[PDB]
Amino acid sequence: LGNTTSSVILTNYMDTQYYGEIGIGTPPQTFKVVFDTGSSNVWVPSSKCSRLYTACVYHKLFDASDSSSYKHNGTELTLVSGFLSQDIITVGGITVTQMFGEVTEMPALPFMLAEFDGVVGMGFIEQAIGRVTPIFDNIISQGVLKEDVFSFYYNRDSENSQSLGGQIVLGGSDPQHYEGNFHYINLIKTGVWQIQMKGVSVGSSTLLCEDGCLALVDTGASYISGSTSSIEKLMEALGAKKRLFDYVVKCNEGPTLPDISFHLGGKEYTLTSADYVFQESYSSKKLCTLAIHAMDIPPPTGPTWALGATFIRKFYTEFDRRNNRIGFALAR
Amino acid sequence: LGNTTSSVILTNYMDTQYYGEIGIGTPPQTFKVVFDTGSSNVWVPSSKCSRLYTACVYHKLFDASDSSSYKHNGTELTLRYSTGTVSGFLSQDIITVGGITVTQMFGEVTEMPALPFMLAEFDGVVGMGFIEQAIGRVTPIFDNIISQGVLKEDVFSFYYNRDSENSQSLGGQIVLGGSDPQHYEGNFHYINLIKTGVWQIQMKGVSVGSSTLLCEDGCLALVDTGASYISGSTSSIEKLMEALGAKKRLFDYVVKCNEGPTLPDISFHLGGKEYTLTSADYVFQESYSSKKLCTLAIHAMDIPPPTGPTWALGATFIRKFYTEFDRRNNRIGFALAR
Amino acid sequence: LGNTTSSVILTNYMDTQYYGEIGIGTPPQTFKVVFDTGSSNVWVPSSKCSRLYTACVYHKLFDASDSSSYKHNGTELTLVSGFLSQDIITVGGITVTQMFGEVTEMPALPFMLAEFDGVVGMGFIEQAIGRVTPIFDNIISQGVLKEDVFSFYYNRDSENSQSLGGQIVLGGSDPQHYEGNFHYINLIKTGVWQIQMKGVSVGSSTLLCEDGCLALVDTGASYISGSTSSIEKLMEALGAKKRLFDYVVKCNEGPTLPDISFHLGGKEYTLTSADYVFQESYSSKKLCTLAIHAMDIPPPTGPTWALGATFIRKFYTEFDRRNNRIGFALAR
Amino acid sequence: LGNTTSSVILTNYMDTQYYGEIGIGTPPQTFKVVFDTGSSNVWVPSSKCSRLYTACVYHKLFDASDSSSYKHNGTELTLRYSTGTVSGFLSQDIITVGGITVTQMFGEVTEMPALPFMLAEFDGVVGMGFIEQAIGRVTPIFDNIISQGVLKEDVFSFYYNRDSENSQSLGGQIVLGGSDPQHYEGNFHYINLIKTGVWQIQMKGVSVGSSTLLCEDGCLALVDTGASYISGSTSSIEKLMEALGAKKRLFDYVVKCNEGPTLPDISFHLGGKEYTLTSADYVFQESYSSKKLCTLAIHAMDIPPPTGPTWALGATFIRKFYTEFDRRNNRIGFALAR
Amino acid sequence: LGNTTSSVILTNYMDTQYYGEIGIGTPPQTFKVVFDTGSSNVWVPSSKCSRLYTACVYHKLFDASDSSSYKHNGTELTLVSGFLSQDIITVGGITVTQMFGEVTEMPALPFMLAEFDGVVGMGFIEQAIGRVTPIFDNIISQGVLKEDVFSFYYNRDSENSQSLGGQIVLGGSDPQHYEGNFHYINLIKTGVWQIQMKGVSVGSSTLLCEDGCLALVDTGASYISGSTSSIEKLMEALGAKKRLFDYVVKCNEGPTLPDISFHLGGKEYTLTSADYVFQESYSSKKLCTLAIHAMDIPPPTGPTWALGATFIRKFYTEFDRRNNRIGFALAR
Amino acid sequence: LGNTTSSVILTNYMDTQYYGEIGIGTPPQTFKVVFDTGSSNVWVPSSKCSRLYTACVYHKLFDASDSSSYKHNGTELTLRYSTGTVSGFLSQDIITVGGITVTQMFGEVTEMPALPFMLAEFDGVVGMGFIEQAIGRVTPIFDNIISQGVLKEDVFSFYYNRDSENSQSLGGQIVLGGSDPQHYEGNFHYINLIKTGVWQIQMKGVSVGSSTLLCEDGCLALVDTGASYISGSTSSIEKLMEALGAKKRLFDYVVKCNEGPTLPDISFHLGGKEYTLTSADYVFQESYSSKKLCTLAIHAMDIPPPTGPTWALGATFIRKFYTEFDRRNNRIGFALAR
């Protein structure tokens, strides 16, 4: 451990994508990336990614020939698909030699939707493709960070202000963006940012996850998600119905929807309807969507709930690698 | 050189005006002022300003007749900025900036045009430029502070925050006599001034996405804490905006708001480092509708000689890069803001 | 009878809620209330209403200890639920001693949706809970009102003007807000503001209420409503279909929808599509909701149609207690 | 005291300017004027106003050279309002207000700042304040009308309507010599003037929702028919707006439009009665979107001594409470408007 | 052939209606008309059209008594329904004696939706009601037009500019509104602006119109249309589903939808998703409609695809009567 | 009469300002100018304009001290337009318009009001009116060009395009010495001037939908290429707008945007032809929402004698009808623009 932290300011796109800048190479080629606890690899699109893929026409491409610190590897990789490479990556004034995927195959679904170019995986080496050492582990190895933790702040989106979209801090947490103190929940096992959940209650009753369930704390996921069956039951409880792609409520009835609490480590983490309905409107004549979706995550990680941006906006989150635990604090 | 550093807390008005408080006179009369590296004079509105100037009805006015430490001068002066002009006369009084007290000559402005000054949240200006550019050859405030031998270094630094809906966010901060490591990370990278007298450096190029399409043979960059935007010459900005697909309006350029998030990066090559802004850094993203127009924080501004033709790096740039102005070594440093 | 009238200016919220100010107590504690011909009691939320109910966290609460004219009663009341109390109520410069409910139980549905605090029931003593003398009867008893009638004006909502939301006049009507002359329909029986309807026609045919039906003229109802089966048939005739909560038409086709006429007292009361579709938009790419809804009102009052705000916006309405009749006039 | 009352029909422009017609000269030249209890002078724009004042291009101008009843004076005068200043010279002519004809001294304004006067639908102002506050000690119009002994009472009354899309709505009404019972209900409740010379009364408190958080130890309220808004001192309004969750902008405070309808009541304790406005009374509710900002009809205004520091009760207040100004008894009456 | 062209500037209403001005009579009475290759008659509403029809209350009516060049015919006509008449019609500085229908019966569906008054049919005499000589044939007969062709430009709608809605050129084409050169497809037969289509492909596959189909190039149609079954299959391929009246996609997924290509005369005419989705919004929380609809056009003309405004906005269109062919060029 | 015609390409700013380029001096100083049949003087901003005039900070300024062909005059002049005034002094220099070079007297403007000129994309004005209306009796530019005997006809013509998002659209075009048949179709129809000295013709009526409700007994129409809108007297426009259901605002009339497309035609009876505009021709249709207000390109403007009372036919009209101004025959021609 050293005495430094490193932060990266994040752009908030529509409350569904949060991404910041990294540089790859000498000199740095700068990319927008999501910092994703749900995966363990760093990857960006390659200059060799065909224009067949419209995804690779609209994103920043890494040109290895323009970097003097680039070292070839070539090992194939299926994260998207491409090959392994080594270079110097700059993340908020920290520079680290890192192995990353140069993606040469990139289908239009989903990464046409991506306002970002790549992903910096903040998960464990256990889930890394090619057992590549993740970037946080490589930065830990430098012995410069104050603590072996990293933290996420995700802001609510505003049309009336050019405020910060969010912030990741490597090596600590930023007290300007939470209140009170952290309470922690231990990981079920190392290798996955997943914790036991003791119940999910809707207002005045625990209707869900009685007898316990799993919660992946996933900074790369837009929403709170559960299994199709869990969400069907949750939405039934809320009075929401599937419009056709998404679940909606009359925008005027959104403010009357009950609190949803997630029971994590002996504490109740509560979202009010303001925290989970997108009040794009408030009229009795409009429908409003919810920031909670079904997602059937297959084994071995799932079936599981995922606590994504919806949850993180409410609760400032600290990922503690020293102690294999996750800390939450309110706000702000 | 002494051992003191002083900070001034700044307010951020809509990402376009950053100002802090100074006190003038005995007892102090307080004013909201922009700290401006693109000018070298101090001025505030005067009680002698005719109230037919509506900007003088809406701002704090200095009243010499309420200050016991006031010293008359009366020399006329006119101060011309790229977006407007003020006129008045010289006075001397005691000025407090971040707990530093300094005897200072400043302009009492008696002519204050409604356009633009009715749109100014700030009252006046504290020029942080060099005496070489001071109108009336008036000694600038920082020079007068340096003369006291209290500052730890002969430098001052700027932090400009992003805007916020929260009251608890600091809009920005100027540090006199040093830099605040709480608001930057990594190392400062320095570029020497082309010449002492102007906070202006060489720029090696400007690239828009994957093309160094501008400043290909070198150009100038004024580092201007008093400028809201990045600016270039009309001809450079026409080309820049063509590349962005932006539409020109009377005072600004806009894109359709839905197109904002996918606009390309823009990089400024300064002293062997590339300084890159993404669209989120230079678009006022106030909607994602195709039916709305979103303004860019990049404008055309033909800065006349001898300072220009030049680009100016203003608040749009400084929000991303913490900036240290070094008078001792005649250089500017940039570090990644946090 | 005297020579006075008393008016109360009403706020229009979204064309669905119309409410004005009353004062309760000495000194007056001021509340937003709907003036409701569909009920017969006055009630406001109590200072003793638990914060368990989020409804009672967001509304003005009556504190009896701060009123020197307050007299305790305590008799339980199920209107919402609470207890009876007496105090002086101020309604547009008229002051009357009135018994009202202090509501201490207030569920989140519907009164979380309420922009108003309480209800002043303008119905008959026959439907009053606890057979409490309604406020209009108590004001009639003072012998100050010019006539034993009260009238309602409900304006259309505007984003481009801060115009009056509406107006209730006690003791008369305001000719500034209607044109021509009143025509009246007698109540089927005293005790309920309900009249015979002789038919409901859609453009060029009487498809509904052939052989007659009931129409409750309900200033507390947002919409024109009929039975589920009547509205199903009406909407079928219009080409509207149930989006999921509400009936909609393509906003561009709204202007082409036929007139709907309600046959009341030998006269035809006609709404054009402008009067019953909420043209929140006009594009061929948007759906627009209608201000007509199904509502199965149970016995003894129903089954019945209700003519609420949708109807009243078109037709200035006079409730005539002397003659047990209801008068309509156009506009304006 | 005579037996006549006269009414003047007022136009309501956007709930912010209420004005009626007067005629000046022979033959009459007509002007749109605000009737203003917060000032004591009459003025209209002058034909002598340089057309470099764009406000003089866009308003009706008095031309003495077309009036046979004009009497020259020429004394310079400047009239300072909280939102702007006009300057000109004194003239006398015959003025008709609601069929009352009165010989009156008024300002011919030759200096008329584009900001704010290009935003004024009205041409000039008829001050309904006391001679004590008349610039140049000019006898105010109401005094001159009282001197004729035609009015039934030495009082005048104001009705300000809500805005309307209908042409048939009366924007408002001033009654000279009495009050119109068609536009109020219940009884007048009266508060004595702190002092003759100013239409200003004691205020006992200001409460926001369930908290007398302001004016706890008493304060002043100017009843100002020339003011669009309720105003208080900057410090009072900061606290008021904190309680409402309102955001400060350059000239106003806003809330998100979706939050407008559920903002708390605001009450003003005047003379043993509470005067309560709901959010619908003080929010310009122009949408219910969370993405839009809605302006409040309550502003900060530091009214300088000797009149202030004071609150001002303007159109926002008068829309709800019909107001009678009583010169005979040096008091103001309020009754619930209808 | 002469050496003149005549153009008419068109108003664009919502990307669904394009209409310009013509004058009928001496002096001209001016009408808004759609110029429609899908029909062969000129008609406008008559002064004798009953106000029974609300369509005829909201449109310009032709008053024959106010024209000194009017000659009576009276022959009944079912296009809408009315009678034949003759007068001088002015179309962009060309004046022609023309027989047209005065429509005296005009139902509320669809022509209440019409922002235009009438139709100038640009189809062939073969489909003319009453075998009335169409207007273009009568103008050809004058021998003034440079070529026996007419061309259509339809602009995309803008809220941010008062740009031209579109343009028809009689006698030629306007190079300011296309790029490159025309390529032509021969009509299957004279008498109908209908061409063979060799396939309709969605991104990477020809799923539709394998073994060929028909394409009516219809300047009077708002959309690209095909049979109910073809569109069902197209929409399935796109991931769009029927909201209730129309097919929609999540507005955020619109940009990821594949290109649709129409194989006409050996060339591929490609629309990107930008060209066929109405991106009224771009959020993940809104639904967006497509400018492609089912339309079962009955014999003898159908079953057929119709290439309407959606197609024409992408491809500037030249209707070549000399050669019985249709030319397309990109843009602009 | 010679054999040359010259065209000047015009830029269309938002359908309200149409301007082209001229060069003044040696070497040329270029200016954006409106070509204005409603005035007879040439002016541009002057380098002598005090920079306290913010409009002079934002526009191109003529500097006589950089022109070798400049000839001093110095006679003061003031130029009054319906929407604002400028003041300055007379100068002479060489002016290039479409490759015609002409020695011309023009105004160097030193007083340039921020309202309206901060809203002007153009720098100055080239009056295309007659010498009879020239302030200071200065010979107008077209007269001076006619005197050279190079033009094919003693006429000039205007084309004003619709606005466009495309860069490749020509905003408009003036042809000196003839007309461009590429931008009109059908035949010109001509109306004689009421009198030489003013580009003003008789109008026989104005009809709104199916009612000649205005100008029933004849009236005047100024054909004014310097006017953005069609205008009439306040009283005529009140009646016109009543018929349209339009609401009056400070500077304009609006309808709800959803109602725009179905507003009735408006026709102007000029010289035995009806000139008809549809709602798409006179509504700024910027949305189809009932919640938004859409401005009409028809305004009230009381044009004082001796020219008015008169209607003015400006850009709203000219966009539809290509206009030829014929000095030889003292007439105006209209043809359908393309």
Ligand SMILES: CCc1nc(N)nc(N)c1-c1ccc(NCc2cc(F)cc(F)c2)cc1
């Ligand atoms: C071209 C000179 C001119 N000629 C005529 N015949 N009429 C005018 N009103 C003007 C004239 C037009 C615009 C301006 N200023 C520009 C302007 C005016 C406005 F009323 C509103 C704006 F936004 C911008 C000044 C004078």
